[PDB]
Design a protein around this ligand. Sequence first.
Ligand code: HEM
Ligand code: HEM
Ligand code: HEM
Ligand code: HEM
Lengths: 141, 141, 146, 146
Amino acid sequence: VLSGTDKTNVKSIFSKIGGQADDYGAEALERMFVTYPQTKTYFPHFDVSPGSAQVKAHGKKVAGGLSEAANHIDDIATSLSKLSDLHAQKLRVDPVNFKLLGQCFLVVVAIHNPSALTPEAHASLDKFLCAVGLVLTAKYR
Amino acid sequence: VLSGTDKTNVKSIFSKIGGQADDYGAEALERMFVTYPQTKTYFPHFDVSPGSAQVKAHGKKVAGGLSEAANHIDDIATSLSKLSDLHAQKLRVDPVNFKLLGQCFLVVVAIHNPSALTPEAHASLDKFLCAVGLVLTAKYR
Amino acid sequence: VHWSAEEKQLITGLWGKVNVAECGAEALARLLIVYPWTQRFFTSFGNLSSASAVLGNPNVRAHGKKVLTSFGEAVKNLDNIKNTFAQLSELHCDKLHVDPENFRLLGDILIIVLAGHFGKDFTPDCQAAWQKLVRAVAHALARKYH
Amino acid sequence: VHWSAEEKQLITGLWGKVNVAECGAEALARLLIVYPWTQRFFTSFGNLSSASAVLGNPNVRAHGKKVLTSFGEAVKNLDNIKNTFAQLSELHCDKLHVDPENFRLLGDILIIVLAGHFGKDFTPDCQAAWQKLVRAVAHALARKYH
Ligand code: HEM
Ligand code: HEM
Ligand code: HEM
Ligand code: HEM
């Protein structure tokens, strides 16, 4: 449920990818929409073509939540509590979908920072990402 | 993460299937071994043939944990804390496997008690079962 | 999939006694209620959102019955399970964009339905044949995911 | 699966530059470490149990390289992806009893490997072709689950 060793390990990678969060947030969704075309069902009001400023504008807030959840890694569920309704209550998002974005999110850090993502970091980050996807899918359980 | 409505709903079904727990525990594994032959990899020291008293003896303790976890539905992780090492640390059980047993477990209650398992009970029981499978797979996260 | 002689017996003998209108509606209602995200696919059906809303919706009964009849076609063809769901695969995959993992969720829920309804006659052997089928069909809608 | 002309280019052009011994060992080590339950399948390899144990095991390097070469065979045959993994399917399914969902876990981890290793040349289009392949292969080991 997130050991002390994973924590001082996830606090660590987010202070190294800090001022790039936002750009990785743009590229993350963009890769998602290309590699998993189905995810576009949810964003029909957007311009989704490679390059969009809505997509840029959106990725800047997805990074937002991530950076934040990392600042409050002891209390991730109060930190993200309004976002759990949007995704589960209102928009009714298939849970399989949280894996896909997170997966895309790792691809991007590995591209721009091959050496932050050691095997072990890959481990801590991977359980942090789908402890974030559990807070956002919480009301289904 | 288990609302007050799911709770007074899971406390309810376990006082109705109370003194049959044990027999449903035997039949549960038995169905698992027949419908998912792979699960027998884990029990090579057992006699697994339809009828076994090891299988009967084992099912009596799997019911055990369940009944117990229900008695302490506010603190399921302290209730089951020694069982999480056995399954995750020592025996290293594929997590997909917790779904299969739980699925078999619902089949058995629906057989012997068609009317306890309304759509709604089916819902409360289904989130209770894989909050139990999360305590037992906890050390992988 | 390859089917045994004795496997077809358990499957066919049991289909023979199933009320499609009853189960059809159980299967679908339970899906909507146990996995509330499946709800967004069915918005044209007016209000879902509460267990009782789901239960008293005429669309849920009518759609439900159609779904089950579909499994009918599998009981009938046993060897030809692709080719029979080809057009249905295009629809679920290409038009709707239902993630395949929900096809498993509907299979499992179906077994609970037949389980509660048939009691002791859902023997373990039979439940194993039924799983082999529910998995074959779910696999045969996956198809159009290439 | 049906492949486009331009799809084979991205796939084939990129295979051309991959170090199988390097990645082979990354892919397998990461699997063992990120999903520690995959560990029980490899007990014949002596100690696993700690990240550094996994890293410094000669078996992990040798096995890893074999796994990747296997994906090689897919790059080569693109149209014939079944039939080429048939014997390998029997082994993973019939003898070992590896649940198919782990084949997906190994695919995803492979993409992270190629991602970190190729940097900016792992364009989004390319990552989409690579996913189509990793999924085709994973599907082609499922096979013997009927
Ligand atoms: C991985 C973790 C995720 C995070 C941190 C996240 C974050 C957010 C945020 C911050 C907002 C807007 C909040 C506001 O200004 O009120 C949002 C909206 C939204 N999200 Fe997510 N999201 C995640 C995953 C997903 C996934 C996987 C999907 C499905 C593909 C999804 C679908 C949507 C949609 C359709 C909107 C609304 C669009 C709009 O407001 O214009 N989200 N999300
Ligand atoms: C669904 C919830 C489960 C519960 C409540 C449960 C409970 C238990 C209990 C109470 C024991 C023996 C404890 C003792 O006396 O020290 C045990 C052992 C074991 N479990 Fe589970 N189990 C569950 C699921 C599973 C699953 C899904 C598998 C994999 C198929 C599994 C594999 C094993 C094995 C191999 C043993 C040891 C055999 C032995 O001690 O002779 N368990 N479990
Ligand atoms: C796994 C077994 C399934 C079978 C055999 C099946 C079969 C069918 C059938 C017979 C139809 C109606 C035929 C037509 O109108 O052309 C249909 C339509 C539809 N199905 Fe499925 N289905 C299955 C699973 C699912 C799942 C898991 C979902 C998603 C939750 C789903 C969502 C839909 C939707 C949204 C429609 C169209 C509804 C409308 O037009 O109002 N189905 N399917
Ligand atoms: C998805 C892509 C995969 C490919 C292409 C692949 C390929 C291979 C190859 C080439 C061999 C050795 C050939 C031989 O000795 O006959 C092998 C054996 C083996 N594989 Fe896989 N594999 C894959 C995934 C997995 C997964 C997910 C697992 C489970 C965690 C696994 C477990 C094993 C085991 C236990 C052996 C035998 C090891 C031994 O004999 O010491 N493989 N596989």
